[PDB]
Symmetry: D2
Subunit: 313 residues, 4 copies
């Protein structure tokens, strides 16, 4: 597999490059960034190769500036982590538009070298995925973002740790925006295939506290460690692996939705999606509880209220 | 880890020995059998080691008679596959009575050498696990059987392949007898954490035909291939790996039930159970639908009908 | 990846189907065999699938008869296991089956042929001939398994992990096999740099290696797990383009002094294009003379 | 397995905590650091758990100050990463004497809680491993350091990439000091078990350039990326995996040598070693060329010079 990471110089990008290169399926990793970081990206490559000696793997790691994008040719997936972080004062809309410009330019330049999938990781992830689809011209099967996937996994760990089960034993889901308007789906939470509502502990579950903790999780990591890198990279690798082996898996990712749900249309939002070799091959239609569906509609409306201002910027 | 396979000369035993030795956690494998099989088991040892060189793994494989059982000392687990094969005219009770003597003798001898877990694979498995618990004297946590685990996995593959998803995406369960009175738990069937009852293809799911195919799958494999060996070994390795890495996972296995479900007491039957480092650390009590619970109760009545005849044989 | 096993109903074929389907890269496994075996292989497909639920893997396993071979199309590799007799008798009988199957493969698609049937060094030659493929496409297991058995021997004698040893046995998959003590390392450290090489019972170890297979036939009825694991190792090297220096049966066109025009076990660089190179190495005088004798025997049968 | 990473707040410590918790054999990971780092470690734990969800693994990660060390008890291994960073004007002896106090106090305190193995990573690695053995009081088997293991891995990738083979195909070694006096052992360089001296490119091998690049590789990553984190972590995980599964493997690591090589005695230096469940179970005696052995002796003399002045620095 050939995967190009635009923004490997970053925290999440560099961790992602490590986790991907050490995989057997990864054969040609392309580390891209702006010119001033090329030397940094040349150090990263070095470091990665050392790990590849201790893990017993090998790959062909490349390093280039954001001008020569023919290195991106024939790439199966291009992960875009490039973006400006949220400093003090920037409104949600301000960062939305700034990173919209960055990500849309990258998507346009990608679409002009080869026909590939674009895995958007930059925030606002829903709006950036929307701008990526617009500026790439690719199909909806090709453009997707990380969305609320990581929040779903962060909810999964908490449900498991409270229920005394392995993390992988719990399989929950949080659809909607990667933000405060997120909707946790207790209807699609099961532990061993057993709906969580079939256990006597679901009555003792502090769902309100767990959901509050999940909502503020990212800012907590930003404050304690300065930022999350290992978890985001692991989730990215999960999606990439589902693609490389065509594991037709029902994950939750940011996707363009065209009415597969009640009133949800013309928006890139976190949704249940069947991922495989051809990217998002389907937007799975699920039955939601009343509360879940009202919240989902409202969240998508907010996401569209932001998508509007970057569609032509 | 140390695991002793009593009956490694057999089909399932031999496949299990290979798939276990290949694992990193396996460090001492003991292949026990009757004396006339000692030449075969040694010939298996050789074969296994060749494969260990191709996978890059290594383990210390031993071969001994079923009269020298001190080699089993300090074993983490003892997997018992030894048993008579069902023949024409042999009723269910005939096999139960014949193999209860075999498994009870082996469990007795195991208890006299060391204090270990006994993983009974021999059939009728729900009844042989009971005989093993009785004659071993171990705690209810130490003795368990494969039960309906393989049936549940065979149900899983059908639900998944019919829903067009990766097998691992489906997580269904079948509790009850490892036989005709098995009750599949549609209440505990989910696909991606999403209860299958929330999908539109659930109404068009041929549930009755799929359960029919599951109930006859064993006879089918026996008529086409001569017996199942790989899949049973994979399920055995699954349980063994949950034990070794204390993966507190909610599986479906043959276990002694003492009132964790209404009307189900004093029997080894297929039930939901939390497996971890201490074997069966809990018999999880879950909400079953009315039809599922009535079926479970009838199934356990049948199982206890067989258990009473062999308890003192 | 798509891989087809001709003879999956057999021992090695069946175990190899299991070990291959289990892997993430295996996406399409085609099980081929004569018509009378179609029900056995079908049963195999069931058992495999159960194990695929126990390992958490998935694949698309197909079952077809050896008179409907269009399902071999687009295959990355086709492993051919189908196969008072003399050595020449078995060679002559299996040559017909191997050559016919290679022929029918060449008429379906341009793919790689992994010869497992014995005599391996001669059946690989016939596969290449009747296939019409390039020398890089057709290859055989050769002394790969013999080298691995010698590896476990060296390692278990020196008290180290099996993967810590890397020895080789080039030449015939038979009595004229030459073990390369010159190319035996333990941690990359030549075995001749240890105080134990003097105490190594090389004669006994090579005796056991030369009769290893026949003893497995007498004690277990045949080898299935080791052969399948070696086959999986080679298929793994191919799928990920791992340019790895393995010892396999290949056609040699003058890559060693005095040996040519034959498919024999040699040191080779395996990669995405099958055998991408016949590595040329320095052998001690004894090793090269023995390899020449082995080459002439193998060519005598060819 | 229980592993305690002292200095997990650092670069290598954090990467190592991730790579280790992610493995199936890791069941209880203890992340230790000074009090002011306790917040960062608490954040790191969060990151780790998120990764554990995406990898399908799970573990019990703990966080505690460097004053509450009773959590280290029962640890299978204690990786010591804590140390000062080399700075402008800090000489080799300066850093040796400074990190000696840190690692020595940590080794003492570890010995006061439990009898575990100590995996020293802090530099000067050979000297710090010697100080750790001295202050811990443990047997020579229990204390060991990363030494020239990563140097050997970097030499491995270079040899392999020049010979056109997979990295796992090459199995070279570099013994000696993790620094100036390292001796690459071309005697123990094999490619598929074939000594590199049996190939046609051994004559074409740019040995001088490759060894020089390896010798300055560390400062180059330090100047380009600010430090190495992933590769050191992977090597640490390699050694830890050998210890957990009793993989009796012949790795090159920093260990105390008592004459297994001619005259090489009374120092912790990079040596070929047989690692297993009991830590460093043996110092392998191999045949080295004349140049290799003389270089190893020079290296050992340098290491002894540094060990001498920090052996009693509390
Ligand atoms: N769940 C999710 O979807 C999550 C979202 N994210 C998002 O991903 C993005 C990356 O995060 P992280 O890697 O932690 O961030 P860093 O700030 O560490 O790195 C981001 C990279 O973006 C590039 N960059 C910065 N400014 C510009 C610019 N003005 N023009 C072009 N490229 C620029 C830089 O690389 P170079 O200098 O090479 O261009 C920089 O290293 C963030 O926006 C974050 O919000 C991350 C984690 C989770
Ligand atoms: N899902 C499940 O729960 C499954 C249950 N099973 C059951 O497990 C058992 C083993 O199956 P399989 O491995 O296919 O069977 P085999 O008959 O191939 O092997 C069982 C072994 O039992 C030993 N054995 C046979 N008779 C006796 C005896 N009278 N006294 C002592 N030992 C004896 C033999 O080994 P030796 O000659 O060395 O003693 C024989 O190899 C069967 O009863 C089968 O029904 C199997 C698969 C799935
Ligand atoms: N080191 C090596 O290279 C090794 C060599 N081998 C060789 O590979 C071959 C396969 O061994 P194994 O799988 O153990 O053998 P089995 O005899 O158990 O099965 C081989 C298969 O060959 C097929 N077959 C038999 N006769 C014919 C025929 N007349 N025409 C077509 N197909 C036929 C059958 O499958 P179907 O009925 O589906 O055709 C049968 O299952 C043997 O010759 C063995 O010597 C095996 C292991 C290691
Ligand atoms: N091949 C090898 O053997 C290599 C050796 N190393 C060496 O190991 C060490 C780790 O390097 P890196 O991880 O990059 O280092 P960092 O400096 O990033 O982290 C080291 C940690 O040590 C702790 N620390 C710093 N000063 C003191 C002190 N005075 N007393 C106690 N603890 C202190 C800090 O954690 P807290 O504040 O929580 O105590 C700090 O995070 C370095 O000395 C490096 O040279 C690294 C890589 C390879
Ligand atoms: K790779
Ligand atoms: K093992
Ligand atoms: K597969
Ligand atoms: K773990």
């Amino acid at each position: 597999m050939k995967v190009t990471i635009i923004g490997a110089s970053g925290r999440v990008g560099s961790a992602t490059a490590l986790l991907l290169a050490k995989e057997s399926f990864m054969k040609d990793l392309v580390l891209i960034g702006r010119e001033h970081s090329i030397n940094k990206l040349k150090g990263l490559r070095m470091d990665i190769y050392d790990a590849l000696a201790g893990t017993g793997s090998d790959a062909n790691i490349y390093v280039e500036s954001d001008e020569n994008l023919r290195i991106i040719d024939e790439s199966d997936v291009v992960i875009i982590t490039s973006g400006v972080a949220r400093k003090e004062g920037m409104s949600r809309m301000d960062l939305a538009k700034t990173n919209a410009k960055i990500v849309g330019n990258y998507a346009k330049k990608i679409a002009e070298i080869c026909d590939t999938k674009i895995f958007v990781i930059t925030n606002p992830v829903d709006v950036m995925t929307y701008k990526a689809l617009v500026e790439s011209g690719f199909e909806k099967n090709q453009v997707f973002g990380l969305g609320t996937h990581l929040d779903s996994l962060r909810f999964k760990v908490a449900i498991a740790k409270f229920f005394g089960v392995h993390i992988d034993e719990v399989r929950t889901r949080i659809i909607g925006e990667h933000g405060d308007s997120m909707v946790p789906l207790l209807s699609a939470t099961s532990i061993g295939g057993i709906p969580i509502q079939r256990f006597e502990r679901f009555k003792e579950l502090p769902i309100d506290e767990i959901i509050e903790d999940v909502k503020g999780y990212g800012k907590q990591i930003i404050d304690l460690k300065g930022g999350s890198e290992f978890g985001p990279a692991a989730a990215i690798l999960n999606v990439v692996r589902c693609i490389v082996n065509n594991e037709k898996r029902l994950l939750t990712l940011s996707a363009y939705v065209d009415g597969e749900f009640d009133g949800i249309r013309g928006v890139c939002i976190g949704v249940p999606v069947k991922i495989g070799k051809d990217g998002i091959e389907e937007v799975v239609s699920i039955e939601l509880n009343k509360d879940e569906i009202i919240g989902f509609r409202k969240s998508a409306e907010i996401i569209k209220g932001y998508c509007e201002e970057v569609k032509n910027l």
